[PDB]
Scaffold this active site. Sequence first.
Site, short mmCIF file in Angstrom:
data_model
loop_
_atom_site.label_atom_id
_atom_site.label_comp_id
_atom_site.label_asym_id
_atom_site.label_seq_id
_atom_site.Cartn_x
_atom_site.Cartn_y
_atom_site.Cartn_z
N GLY A 9 0.81 -1.24 0.00
CA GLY A 9 0.00 0.00 0.00
C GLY A 9 0.83 1.28 0.00
O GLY A 9 2.04 1.21 -0.33
N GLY A 11 1.02 5.26 2.53
CA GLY A 11 0.81 5.68 3.93
C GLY A 11 0.91 7.18 4.17
O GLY A 11 1.12 7.92 3.19
N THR A 12 0.77 7.60 5.44
CA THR A 12 0.80 9.00 5.95
C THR A 12 2.02 9.74 5.36
O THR A 12 1.85 10.90 4.96
CB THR A 12 0.78 9.05 7.49
OG1 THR A 12 -0.27 8.24 8.02
CG2 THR A 12 0.61 10.44 8.04
N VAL A 16 4.50 1.71 1.43
CA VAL A 16 4.58 0.59 2.42
C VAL A 16 4.79 -0.74 1.68
O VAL A 16 4.18 -0.91 0.62
CB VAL A 16 3.31 0.50 3.30
CG1 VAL A 16 3.52 -0.45 4.47
CG2 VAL A 16 2.84 1.86 3.78
N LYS A 31 8.07 1.21 5.92
CA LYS A 31 7.60 2.54 5.46
C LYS A 31 8.84 3.30 4.96
O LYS A 31 9.81 3.40 5.73
CB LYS A 31 6.86 3.30 6.57
CG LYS A 31 5.54 2.71 7.03
CD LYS A 31 4.75 3.63 7.96
CE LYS A 31 3.58 2.94 8.64
NZ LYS A 31 2.87 3.85 9.59
N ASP A 125 -6.52 8.32 15.26
CA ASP A 125 -6.93 7.75 13.96
C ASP A 125 -7.31 6.27 14.09
O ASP A 125 -6.86 5.42 13.27
CB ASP A 125 -5.88 8.03 12.88
CG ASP A 125 -6.50 8.00 11.49
OD1 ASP A 125 -7.73 8.27 11.37
OD2 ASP A 125 -5.79 7.65 10.57
#
Lengths: 286, 276
Positions: A9, A11-12, A16, A31, A125
């Site tokens: 995926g 991320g912030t 990832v 990350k 979150d």
Amino acid sequence: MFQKVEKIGEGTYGVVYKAKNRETGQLVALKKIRLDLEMEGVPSTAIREISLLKELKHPNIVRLLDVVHNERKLYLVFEFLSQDLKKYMDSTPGSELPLHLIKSYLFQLLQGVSFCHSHRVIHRDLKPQNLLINELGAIKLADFGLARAFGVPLRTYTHEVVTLWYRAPEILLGSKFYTTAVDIWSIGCIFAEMVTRKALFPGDSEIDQLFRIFRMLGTPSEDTWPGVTQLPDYKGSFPKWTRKGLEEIVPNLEPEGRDLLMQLLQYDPSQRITAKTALAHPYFSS
Amino acid sequence: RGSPLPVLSWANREEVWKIMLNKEKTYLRDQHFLEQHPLLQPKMRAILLDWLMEVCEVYKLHRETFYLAQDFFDRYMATQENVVKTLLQLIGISSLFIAAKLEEIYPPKLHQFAYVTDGACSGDEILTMELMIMKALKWRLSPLTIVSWLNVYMQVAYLNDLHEVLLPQYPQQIFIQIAELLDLCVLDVDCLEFPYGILAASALYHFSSSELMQKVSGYQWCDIENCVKWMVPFAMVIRETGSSKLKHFRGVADEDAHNIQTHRDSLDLLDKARAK
């Protein structure tokens, strides 16, 4: 360096990946921060996540294994867990969560959150995507990039926090202060989502989000939530919906579970049950 | 020391306190760290930290941000050796950049951290140094600061009937008066002999009583006595010069103004205080 077996995926900060350590053969999640693309250097979210997870160690919190600075990349190395609760509920085994598992997942969630709050950390979150499950039944809080170590007492922090569907009404109404209570609201939303298989309040805007909550719980008043009319984004022009009975929303949930859900989704953050108190609830008693 | 906290809805008050006390054990300070930098003088640390307080007031940074930076600077220098005096500015402004990204909602941009150094520190030099600092500290960037302890003591002092610990409810003037003594003390490297909670309890004692110090801190006299005696000349110089009034800051709610870092000519005061 790290055998990047697969991407899993974005991320912030950055992207990832799943991977293997060569000198151990152990699975990790990666990350990657491209420091070349960061005008402000290491992003605030990464400095917060790393510093918090260096000291926040608990069975129901994801472990940060290492931080690697190599060339102009910073790698955050986390323990590898099989999937998140959202991907699990979206897949065939997980379409219908057993009542015992909903209870054991919620208990663990509350244990992790209770440990954060006792350590003066607010996650900000909590949603199924950020809860990682292993093959043995454990569930763990992940993505501490949006978290903050709070002072006792605390001050005003970032105004607009928490993924919209999991966002507590004190944030939607623009309260100056929010507390650990915003995490408990998110847990309430996650509990209902485990029982019903879908988001409790899937708003498309702050006002839509606020309206979906009022429709279900009734429009707050000075009587049910003292000071609410004084809150900055409160308006007398809100419809006066009336509290729906909870049995209609979560009928397959046992009565003590519905009591707990109702205490988790108190709209007055002052009256909202704490994680510690939730763990003592009869729903969890044998 | 027993917990000065009330019963909490959200945790065991004794665990919450144990966890806070364990921080002072995990985060180490060394009043002698400049022996590892043998041609540096303690006055150089005073000048650097005084300058960071000035930058903080210009940019309206929180007192928490300044004390994070002070802690990062002191812990980082304790991990290094033989640092030349011409790099203290870079280490200090990089410590404050890290602190600002941690603690502020909208921290100043890198370009402002470079700007305030008047050509001595580039953006690139600050980005190199921030990684050097955070790796040397092992990303231990969550101390309980000197000012965090004052914050908790003030909240216990003024605790309402509802025993509310998370919503702030103390007066502003007592807070900034005690912080001003703490800002003077922290310019002296000898302050690092005392735990941060004891430095804060000691400055509070100098503005109050044994009875209030014990109530808010849980310390006994024997715990703070050496710190209190060391702090005497600092308290005297503050009482003789007079305490600063609460400032107004552009865009800061006047009720939150006490959380903003201030700056006065403290090097003058520091000279007088160390003189005695």
